[PDB]
Structure 1
Amino acid sequence: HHHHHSSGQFREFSIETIRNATSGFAAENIVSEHGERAPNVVYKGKLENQRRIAVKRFNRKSWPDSRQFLEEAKAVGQLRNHRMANLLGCCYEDEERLLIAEFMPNETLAKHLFHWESQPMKWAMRLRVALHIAQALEYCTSKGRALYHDLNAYRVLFDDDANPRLSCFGLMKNSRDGKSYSTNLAFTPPEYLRTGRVTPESVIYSFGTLLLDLLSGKHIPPSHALDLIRDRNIQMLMDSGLEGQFSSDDGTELIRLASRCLQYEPRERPNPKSLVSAMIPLQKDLEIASHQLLGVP
């Protein structure tokens, strides 16, 4: 009952295996947004042993040299941690360039925060998300993957137990020669648009934007949020759907953490160890299981 035991070692899959598992990349199995119009596409799959997988399918042009693709995929595939949707393998046969990860069946932070079905996300879950993602980043950095290419709400996934995890796919670029941030520039770190180079300090700024998303319940430009915080207009910032779930004090403390993350100078931002340390004491409702908190099983 696969989510019981360890992920198992990184391996190379055949294209027949992956075609069989995804019903030949059936559009019905697309789990990413925008169907086949997106520059890459993620499919749900199921292996013959019933293990569920996520298959990221790239255009050959993104990763034309399979040797480079495999090398990168293998390095990411060494990482194994319960805060990650871990990378199980890759496939580079028949002109395909595929990454294979643990399937996370409860969608994304984007879905449950911005596009919720039952109920808005509970404060305690928002905090659990921030902790788990901080622990994921600390893990990744400890294993020599300190870059993460566009940390945002779509990278946060919910596992079989409805626990938040970080996508392994963002540990690699969307193409060999591409940009590390392909999303709206108003959300990117200030030095990024100067240099076009992702550093570990970039990821921390992006964690800050994740915090702002969690605080506000919407995808707020950081300059707008920072104006509100500067002017002490917190009631304009905070999600009105959180009313009565949090102290002014613990809300304050999370905004303080966001402010550090979002510092203009990269050397002033916290590191992942420090994010973990700041998030631990903020945790609430430890006794409520994630499936109950999220509103799933």
Structure 2
Amino acid sequence: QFREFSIETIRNATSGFAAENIVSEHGERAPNVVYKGKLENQRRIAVKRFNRKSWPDSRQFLEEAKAVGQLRNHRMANLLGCCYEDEERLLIAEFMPNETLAKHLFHWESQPMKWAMRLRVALHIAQALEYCTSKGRALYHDLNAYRVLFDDDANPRLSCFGLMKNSRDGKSYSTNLAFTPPEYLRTGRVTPESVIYSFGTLLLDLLSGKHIPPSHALDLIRDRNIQMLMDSGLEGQFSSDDGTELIRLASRCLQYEPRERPNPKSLVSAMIPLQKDLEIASHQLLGVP
């Protein structure tokens, strides 16, 4: 059950917000900063530490956090609690010991991620988004490979932290505008449809092994240019038909017009027929112990 924590408890768990406990990607001075910790009950946790002045009203911070804390699903790294003592604003979530999609996808050492695993990530994250939407949290902020985490069983999960903005005014987003939906600059707001656009960018990341701005992915996607768009590391692992189908899905998600993008249920239905090696454990497919 979602609960409150004291700041002393969280400082103890994180060894005083020690810099080497940072597990997020932007270092100590960023709008998004996350620390690993360990509670006295031996539970490992992830602690997002919001910047000063980001959520100045404790009541509105607590109410958002509580709302997110109602969500409980096995495709999410779930929200366990919050802290709002002494001007701090913290979210406490389940710790994900097998690190991020970005690590495995962009910074692989032994070999590139398998096709079947990339498809499993895409499906499970779509399912997570469908779940969030069903529980009234249809907005997700800065969806990218750093928000996809792998649990103890190496299963991919969506970080709960993105269900809240980095700041109450929404101006502390991390996403470079090259990757934001076209309507976001105009409106300054995330909508359910803009989340789908961001899912498109995740699909492009998975297909390519690269972080390619959608505008650049444009002619490549038009030409279904497998050589240019697809990760060379995948060669041999997928049929041209299946690769093309995932490209087409990404195209749908990246449509300029928000109303033309698929809804979360359509993402799931499009992803299911493409799944491979369903009977193989994520530990094995991902190549982690």
TM-score by length of 2: 0.97
Shift of 1:254: 0.6
Q: Please list the CA deviations of residues 273-296 of structure 1 after superposition, one character each: whole Å capped at 9, or x if unmatched.
A: 111111111111112211111111
Contact map agreement 1:150 1:180 (CA 8 A) in 2 = no
CA distance in 2, matches of 1:296, 1:231: 35
Contact map agreement 2:32 2:174 (CA 8 A) in 1 = no
Shift of 1:128: 0.3
Contact map agreement 1:180 1:198 (CA 8 A) in 2 = no
Task: Sort the Cα spacing of 1:27 and 1:182 in 2 relative to 1 into closer, same or farther, 3 A.
Answer: closer
CA distance in 2, matches of 1:205, 1:106: 26
Unaligned runs of 5+ in 1: 1-8
Unaligned runs of 5+ in 2: none
Task: Sort the Cα spacing of 1:228 and 1:70 in 2 relative to 1 into closer, same or farther, 3 A.
Answer: same
Secondary structure at the aligned position of 2:47 is classed as strand
Instruction: Report the more deviating stretch, 76-85 or 16-25.
Output: 16-25
Query: How many residue pairs are counted as aligned between the two chains?
Result: 289
Shift of 1:180: 7.0
CA distance in 1, matches of 2:206, 2:61: 34
CA distance in 2, matches of 1:260, 1:62: 34
CA distance in 1, matches of 2:129, 2:224: 30
Contact map agreement 2:154 2:283 (CA 8 A) in 1 = yes
TM-score by length of 1: 0.94
CA distance in 2, matches of 1:255, 1:29: 37
Secondary structure at the aligned position of 2:64 is classed as helix
Shift of 1:249: 1.1
Q: Please list the CA deviations of residues 28-62 of structure 1 after superposition, one character each: whole Å capped at 9, or x if unmatched.
A: 21111243222342111111111110001112311
Contact map agreement 2:166 2:173 (CA 8 A) in 1 = no
CA RMSD of aligned residues (A): 1.2
Shift of 1:118: 2.1
Q: Please list the CA deviations of residues 178-235 of structure 1 after superposition, one character each: whole Å capped at 9, or x if unmatched.
A: 3374321111111111111110000001101100011111001111112112234332
Task: Sort the Cα spacing of 1:190 and 1:41 in 2 relative to 1 into closer, same or farther, 3 A.
Answer: same
Contact map agreement 2:113 2:286 (CA 8 A) in 1 = yes
Contact map agreement 1:46 1:53 (CA 8 A) in 2 = yes
Shift of 1:143: 0.2
CA distance in 2, matches of 1:104, 1:141: 22
Write out aligned runs for 1:1-297 (5 A): 9-179=1-171, 181-297=173-289
Contact map agreement 1:155 1:170 (CA 8 A) in 2 = yes
Instruction: Report the more deviating stretch, 239-248 or 32-41.
Output: 32-41
CA distance in 2, matches of 1:232, 1:122: 20
